[PDB]
């Protein structure tokens, strides 16, 4: 998201995600923990095993928040201000980890929506996720 064409692509792609945002959210977190073990450090209080109820629940929160942003592309800093504070001031999440979760989310979308995950859509989704990441690290 940023340009009109990207906003169109992003709203369109996420309509195909639909009710599965929570499921994909959880799968992406799993891919992240396994592929990039450094990230487990932020989740000491979670059972990190496959099909964990906490990971499932937290995946639902991530999916809902991305759904939030898709409907507020014209003002991401306003819509996601509560989360900027949580991730940057309270949790002090290393900005590199946002790039890793983004990659894992794109990977998860490719698995489940191979025909819809075209080069043009992949490009707009990448910009969208980078814009979300900037907002969440904006206190930095």
């Amino acid at each position: 998201v940023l340009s009109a064409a990207d906003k169109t692509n992003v709203k369109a792609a996420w309509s195909k995600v639909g009710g599965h945002a929570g499921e994909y959210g959880a799968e992406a977190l799993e891919r992240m923990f396994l592929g990039f073990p450094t990230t487990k450090t932020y989740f000491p209080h979670f059972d990190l095993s496959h099909g964990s109820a906490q990971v499932k629940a937290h995946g639902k929160k991530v999916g809902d928040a991305l759904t939030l942003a898709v409907g507020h592309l014209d003002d991401l800093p306003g819509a996601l201000s509560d989360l900027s504070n949580l991730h940057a001031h309270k949790l002090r999440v290393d900005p590199v980890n946002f790039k890793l979760l983004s990659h894992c989310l794109l990977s998860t979308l490719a698995v489940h929506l191979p025909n819809d995950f075209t080069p043009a859509v992949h490009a707009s989704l990448d910009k969208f996720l980078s814009s979300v990441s900037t907002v969440l690290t904006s206190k930095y």
Partner: protein, 145 residues
């Protein structure tokens, strides 16, 4: 670079099923579309204006195939990555002047493409092993910088 025995076997089993031409062309094409500053290095390939022009360009497909063939060599030589890519490292640094961050980008794009082609067979555990390979290759190509 360092897998378990089970992990190497899984990595290798997936590779038997990789069409270096379809995957290579797709991976290179996506890199050029998603990170469009990479297009500067491929000026000689002609029209790269829009996603349609990129994905159907014969020079993109042909060069993609060559990239994936070279990746395949790394996959079959996991204990000697640095020696396998020493000549290619020199080429990218000395002649081409490609920033090494771009090797990680292409590696990740390739993982996304594998995910697209194999779907649920490209499990979280298998991607985790592929992230290791991809990073090993990127590090071996950066070595002579």
């Amino acid at each position: 670079v360092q897998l378990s025995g089970e992990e190497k076997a899984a990595v290798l089993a997936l590779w038997d099923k990789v069409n270096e031409e379809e995957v290579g062309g797709e991976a290179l094409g996506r890199l050029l579309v998603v990170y469009p500053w990479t297009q500067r290095f491929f000026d000689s390939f002609g029209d790269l204006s829009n996603p349609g022009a990129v994905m159907g360009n014969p020079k993109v497909k042909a060069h993609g195939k060559k990239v994936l063939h070279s990746f395949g060599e790394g996959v079959h030589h996991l204990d000697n990555l640095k020696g396998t890519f020493a000549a290619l490292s020199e080429l990218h640094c000395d002649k081409l002047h490609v920033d090494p961050e771009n090797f990680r980008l292409l590696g990740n794009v390739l993982v996304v493409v594998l995910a697209r082609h194999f779907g649920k067979d490209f499990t979280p555990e298998l991607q985790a092993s592929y992230q290791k390979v991809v990073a090993g290759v990127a590090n071996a190509l950066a070595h002579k910088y």
